[PDB]
């Protein structure tokens, strides 16, 4: 292996006003959307589940 | 502390409205459930 | 039992509860005094135009108000401990009765000689006889010999419960798998009430305790007949 830290320091300091969690490129975006989607979706689902369990099925 | 006069003065009339609206947001939903309490226990 | 508009403690029936009462009286005096002192002083600080906002020295007066409350706590712990040691005192009982909590009633067991046992339920408000106390009556009272040192063993067969008898100064938790001892001793004959003192479910408010303190003789007859 070779030290490529300098390449990464440059990329991440590249003044494009991007927040560190997206400053890595297009991938960051994708990962974040997946994450956020899952979280919110899962959250809805859970709300669903609380609803279901709130009522008796005798 | 010192402060500048109200930018949007709330006249007594407006306040009465505020106060009332406030108490009602508390008192009504409860008053409702509390009223139909009997209708709930055995239904 | 308690009467309407009661302020203090239910009258002392045992010598131990007579002890707690006298102790609570000197303790409460201090509680009043201090709380009223603070209040007065609060008022004292707030009733003057005179001022002194520059720095005030602390190490000199902190000796005063550390040592003072200090001496006071001791004037509460001393009688508190001697009395605590008292309740533990070895005494040698004449009888031994076990009680076991159950959701939601008390079962009793007098097994020194005979194999006597019985459940004890709260008399519903609907089946109370004229003059009988709501929520406080049971069908089977705990008959016991007045003026005798008795040993009560408490436990439970389900969740936690707690056996209490205010007038005699008693409260022992009913813990499943455990056998808690506590001594009873009434200085008088009569009926003595208590209530389950540990959340135990749906009817925790409804499973009281009544004790019937009669003389030895009647106690014996009752034991026999209860067979």
């Amino acid at each position: 292996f070779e030290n490529r830290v300098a390449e990464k320091q440059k990329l991440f300091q590249e003044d494009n006003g991007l927040p560190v969690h997206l400053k890595g490129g297009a991938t960051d975006n994708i990962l974040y959307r997946v994450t956020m989607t899952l979280c919110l979706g899962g959250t809805l689902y859970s709300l669903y589940c609380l609803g279901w369990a709130s009522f008796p099925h005798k | 502390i010192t402060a500048k006069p109200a930018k949007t003065p709330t006249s007594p009339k407006e306040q009465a409205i505020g106060l009332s609206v406030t108490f009602l947001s508390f008192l009504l939903p409860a008053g409702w459930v509390l009223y139909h309490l009997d209708n709930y226990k055995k239904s | 039992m308690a009467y309407p508009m009661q302020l203090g403690f239910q009258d002392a029936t045992s010598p131990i509860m007579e002890e707690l009462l006298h102790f609570h009286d000197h303790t409460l005096m201090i509680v009043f005094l201090i709380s009223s002192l603070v209040l007065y002083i609060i008022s004292l600080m707030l009733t003057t135009k005179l001022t002194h906002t520059s720095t005030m020295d602390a190490q000199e007066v902190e000796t005063i108000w550390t040592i003072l409350p200090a001496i006071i706590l001791i004037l509460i712990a001393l009688p508190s401990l001697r009395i605590l040691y008292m309740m533990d005192e070895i005494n040698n009982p004449s009888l031994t009765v076990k009680t076991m909590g159950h959701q939601w009633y008390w079962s009793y067991e007098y097994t020194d000689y005979e194999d006597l046992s019985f459940d004890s339920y709260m008399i519903p408000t609907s089946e109370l006889k004229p003059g009988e106390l709501r929520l406080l009556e049971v069908d089977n009272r705990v008959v016991l010999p007045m003026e005798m040192t008795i040993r009560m063993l408490v436990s439970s067969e389900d969740v936690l419960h707690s056996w209490a008898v205010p007038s005699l100064g008693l409260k022992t938790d009913a813990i499943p798998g455990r056998l808690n001892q506590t001594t009873l001793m009434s200085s008088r004959p009569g009926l003595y009430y208590g209530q389950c003192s540990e959340i135990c479910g749906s009817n925790h408010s409804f499973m009281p305790i009544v004790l019937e303190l009669v003389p030895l003789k009647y106690f014996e007859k009752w034991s026999a007949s209860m067979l």
């Binding site: 030290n3 320091q9 300091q13 | - | -």
Partner: protein, 98 residues
């Protein structure tokens, strides 16, 4: 039994930590890491309070071992005095980032 291959701070430090490291090599304190030593706080020898605007908040611990700190904005211009002990403080504006 030995060798290398591990970057040093000098070679890899970047960003703000590099700046601090560099400025620290020159005996400077741009990012207020050290506690400034007090002058005699007289009219003639005031405490030189650096800054990057026309004012900065000063905290005056009048006497050593005081628990209460006196705070006030130090304005560019005439040297001001601590409302408590009266020691003098003078703002000495801008630069830092060349």
């Amino acid at each position: 039994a030995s060798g290398g291959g591990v970057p040093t701070d000098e070679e890899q430090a970047t960003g703000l930590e590099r700046e601090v490291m560099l400025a620290a090599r020159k005996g400077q304190d741009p990012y207020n890491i050290l506690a400034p030593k007090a002058t005699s706080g007289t009219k003639e020898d005031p405490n030189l309070v650096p800054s990057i605007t026309n004012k900065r908040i000063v905290g005056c611990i009048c006497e050593e071992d005081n628990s209460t700190v006196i705070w006030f904005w130090l304005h560019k211009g005439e040297a001001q005095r601590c409302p408590s002990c009266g020691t003098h403080y003078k703002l000495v504006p801008h630069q830092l980032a060349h």
